[PDB]
């Protein structure tokens, strides 16, 4: 059982919430659910750099890197149906909403994560819903990160 | 039979529009005359053709143009493309940052149509778009500088 | 590419429609759109039988089996994750709606088609929304029954 | 170190409840005494314990009941049971149909809880339900005729 | 391509044997004609062929039959059937009761050869035995109602 | 450690139980006495158990006979026997020709569970049935002549 | 296309080179003529070819023979026969007791080459040996009766 | 643990026989004393045990012998030997060209049971048959010079 | 039809290039004449063609040249080179040192485009970089001595 | 199990060399002590080991070192790197020659070391590629290369805290 | 089509090479004459071609030579021989005990080039080196007795 | 756990011979003592062990030696070495030039026994031959310096 995390897991309210009240204590409680769960959690490297730019520090980072595999996808030898590209175009549209940089980098981050999930045949988890629609049309299992903590529980 | 994939740049953008005719309708007609004589199969994505009709073409143009230029859908479904083609698409959009935004993104959509059609048929892409040129050069699609396209019509018998 | 069909594709409107106004010629134009493409269509045995008794007869059925493989899912020697069953539980909930036999049998053919798609790793098609959400939770490539023609065109 | 998985029917349904005692608290307490003297480990699904506490159990005794019996939920995620199981689920669903259908569905849900915990731990299932006993025999769970459950408790020293 | 596995019923039992021709051997020859013009391969296991050749097929037709129908017995080995398949097969021997036990067991042997062949090749079983057809359906064998068999070969060309 | 799969023939066949003791009920009792002291585990299929219960079993023995014998069915669901086994089973029906044919067919089911159970556990099969022991020897099951069963129980201490 | 695995019996058995012309070498020649117009590919394991040269064939036809008959030995290493074959193979060597024993061993090696080639290619085997055909019919090789070989190369052009 | 596989030779051929004890039966008895104190599991193919029990064993020793010797034939099915083995095998039967022929073949079947069992368990093949030792060394089986077998159970204990 | 893959050294390096002609434009022209008459196809990576266009080529010949020589760069994405190539590749960067920092990387980018394109198309590499020819021979690319290139075109009709 | 692929930088570059202990060899020793208890398996290719031995490690640690560090070279043969890697590799090799420069033999020698690092680094990265293992190294160039190719990464700053918290 | 893999012996050793023509260089030239008119394509490894080039081959034929004899070396990566080949190969070096030892190892490298190329392409190795042909039969390469090679190309036309 | 493929040099060459003890037999015995206390399994190919047994080992040491050092030969068949291993192996024999070439050939055979065994098992090949170490490094075998071997078995208890 393999899971593919996303930055929204530790950023989106009611997803960050329902984990814990404090940010770093929320990551710590996720860590506590991990290190005991039978599953393994992957997180693409750019997402890790994004998160570490916000709040992560050495003490919490040690646990986080022990429990979450920091891995970018096997960039190549992975082959997507043409669907994705055309489909992905629409995603970019929905992310126009100073805007261009963050929107395009966010879309690249989205594709990076969903590609990792597709490669590993793992379950992507992410709060953002356009990501969900894309990932279901490309063919990846999704778990609502609100219920992800419910999943780590009962999986320990 | 040496298959070509026609991007609409050859019918609009200058420096490749010229050397065919001074007049756009006669440039299209003379390109048509060079077609059906050279041992070639010209392909064009459907949206490109309909836009061309809305851009400049009229019905007398379009009838003969369809009769000789194969307007074919780029197998938009179940085509097995390699991964980073999407990342080159993102890098293109990053370079295509510049009502205006919608035109940019939809132009990107059409250009991707053309490139994917060429990739699928392995045909030779002809295009004036330099960014599309680098993207197609990296993806692995046969390229032609379209300033030679008329120069390719004859010399192709 | 591989697809897994279901009776809704030929019974429920919104996929009954836009194929053809006449039902038998709707199936026939679906047949003609196939018989040319590169995709393979499967249909579990009971599903096909329920379809056949009702509307499809000797005039069209020969063609139907010339293009569509009738195969019950390889029930035996296959494993599904346990949580599926509560998923199925909840599906039975959504089918509580005389109706006892209809609901139980419909869930029966539901799992027939779902497991066939899971084994073949194909792209399920079905009009019923509950089955669509079930497939999303289990992790099946699922496409809209109306999008199915739009896929057939651009394949033939 | 023999492992046992209990059931609602063990305590609540008579005909297996009897041969322990007639006053329910006395029988549950003598069951507590019989266990933890034997070399057995007892498991009981969590929600099943909660519903039992809703039926008869009181907080006076549960402390020792939670010392000897493990109130554990099944590893219901990441557990990969044979797919066909669900098929006879539906078969079983039929044999449980008889607004009472919601009660039947709750019964089915709890029965699956117990059976899946036993399949996870490979323990000896105990349950008075011939419906659940047949299912456990088919899927491959160790069984015990629960009328001999006390007769099992002794000889387990 | 598409693969078919045949049974002696296809060439012995009318109502699939008709729809080809009234006179039997000519119906065999007509099926020979329809195959080799279709885009499918046809397999038919060893013992079944021995039985059918004992019955009606003669030296004249045998040449074409072996030209287009691979007389091959299933891989006999290296094929791991699901365990309960055996149990299911028992049920057939349960229902095949009808001094004719030699015939009964030989029929069971030919039927299991045919079904296992259709299992190994993942081919399409065609047969008039309703008992075998339900077994093949439940195990997961691709099926074709033989009353449509001729109709299939026209639609493949 | 050491696992044994019984047959109800062991407690039923006249020749082998008497070595436990002259009284068949006392034979079962002394078998239980030898068990519970050996380092071995005893499994028995549900069908074989209930066929035995149709012979002699009552509560007095039944308690301990079910404590130190796991009445467990093979994991019929989700196990992969090899194909030739099925073919072999056919020839057993050739030996099981034995009015009585119905019983013979039921024989298969109960009998097959034993073998399957062993195959699943890689256990040690005990059965006075010559046909069963031949089938097990072909299929690859650990075997022990039941005439020595007592001694094998005796030495485990 | 279609692949045949010949055998030295096809040219050394009076039964099989009849149905070609009586002159046996010229029967080989007409066999070659039927090939090169058939849509098949005809293999013959190398030792079998050496045997055929030792007995009967020679240069003048030999050139054409090698043109159209891929003299290829089975890819012994990196091929996995299921183990039962070996016990099966024992049968053959047994019934190949029959100057006497060394010839039996050598023939057994030639026959195992032929059968393994037809097994590896999933080809069709032809041979006049009843033993070879029985062994192939068990292990799962395609068969074509060598009496009907001429008619099989015709209808195959 | 560590698993040995015994050929009957270790109880027949002196120097791997007398080293335990000069008399046959006390030799077997002291071997059984060494085992069941060693930390190894000892295996013997069924036919080997039949062959021995037809030579010397009597119901006295048989108890302990079947206590600490898993009598197990190879899982012939669901085991895929590599092809070239078979040719290997023939050479061994080749060497047995030397009544004797039928005995030679039966010995070959027993020997191949021993070797395939050792291959399947990846156990340690102990046997005095130098031909068997060479064959198993080539195929890749663990080996113990049976002259040291006694020592190997004084250790491991 | 053969596919040839051209390296810019074919036109630059006079040693290969004098035999077409002594003046570079006329030599390109005679090469163009030789092509379009051969049944072969000629390929050139886009970067290599650009580096050519910088040196001597101009618009006059370009068209005709670009009609006959397909300008395409290797499909970098969706290609799986083997690992030792990469280590081999370092050796090239090793020797490409000696105008200093960037010339070597330019050389290696063009060279690896060419070699990988030949690998992808399974075409025939024509080049004068003796190091590149050794590298292509090792990796497994076809080779034509460029000294003979003119002949190899004349002989292709 | 979890699998780590070391790089010699871990045992030469400070700020991962420290954070274990002060003394060099005793820093190696404390790293080993954190290993041999951790659930992970530590790989470190052959030539990397040779050079590390030539830098600091001597025989007094060697027994322990080879006890819990699988000195294994990448299975070069029978491994297929996707094509673009070779181009990507270019740019990484493109950078190292610039940091070699940015007096004749003085800048000449740095190029030699860069292009030999270009071989040791490729062994390490390919081992991590093949095993699907986690790559730890201080070379930001290697880290960015592995980020692009898709190797499991771990900051060597946390390496101690990774073998701690790993039993 | 019918791929052949040549060898230096085919053009050096007599008795195989006169059959084209007695005068050596013209014998090679008429070999090329037969080629280019056959429906066969002739590979030849790089080292072997260069070894031929040192001895006799000259400039005029060279052109025509590379017209049809594809000079390609075995893919040598991502090709997985079966392990026994290595041991097999040892004996060849053994038989090449026969300066001379360096010559022996160089010849062994060239021969492994040829045999591996034929193994990879599944082409038909042709070579007069008797040891090489025995090795090729064992490993499983097609073969064509080179004494017939001239014939093998005529009527292959 | 942690598998070590030993080698004859481990018990023949000082500096891995001497680090356990001074005299040969006592060094073997103390190595044997260190093993059986390590958590590591120690294989040794059959031919290598027979070579050692030729050199020094006798009954007294041999019993223990075979108790704890598995004497297993590589599973030659069904192992797929990648191609250039063979080519790599080539120059190893080159470097083994050193009447006397027979020793080099046999050394090569046993060395490939050891290295292949380690490759198959994915063990930690210990060896003193620096050529073997280099070859095993390039191919991708684990390694530990035999100079440290004693220490490695300690620190591992």
Author numbering:
A (entry chain L), C (entry chain A): 2 to 98, 131 to 189
B (entry chain K), D (entry chain B), E (entry chain C), F (entry chain D), G (entry chain E), H (entry chain F), ...: 1 to 98, 131 to 189
J (entry chain J): 1 to 102, 125 to 189
What does the published report state?
Here, we present the homo-dodecameric structure of the HARP from the γ-bacterium Halorhodospira halophila SL1 (Hhal2243) solved by cryo-electron microscopy (EM) at 3.37 Å resolution. Hhal2243 assembles into a dodecamer in a left-handed screw-like manner, with each molecule being rotated by approximately 58°, except for the interface between dimers 1/1* and 6/6*. Upon completion of the single screw turn, the first and last dimers (1/1* and 6/6*) encounter each other at a slightly larger angle of 70° (top view, left) and laterally displaced (side view, right); they cannot form the same inter-dimer contacts as dimers can form within the screw turn; the steric clash between dimers 1/1* and 6/6* terminates oligomerization. Hhal2243 consists of a PIN-like metallonuclease domain into which two helices are inserted that we termed the ‘spike-helix’ (SH) domain. The PIN-like domain is formed by six α-helices (α1–α4, α7, and α8) and four β-strands (β1–β4) that fold into an α/β/α domain with a central, four-stranded parallel β-sheet. Two Hhal2243 monomers align head-to-head with their SH domains consisting of helices α5 and α6 to form a dimer, while two SH domains form a four-helix bundle resulting in six spikes that protrude from the dodecameric assembly. The dimer interface covers a buried surface area of 1300 Å2 and is mainly of hydrophobic nature with two clamping salt bridges formed by R141 and E91 from either monomer, respectively. The covered interface between neighboring dimers extends over 900 Å2 and involves the long α4–α5 loop of one monomer and the α7–α8 loop as well as helix α8 of the respective other monomer. Application of this method to Hhal2243 revealed a stable dodecameric assembly of 295 kDa that included 98% of all molecules in the sample. Our Hhal2243 structure supports the prediction that these residues constitute the active site of the protein, including an almost perfect superposition with three of the four active site aspartates of AtPRORP1.
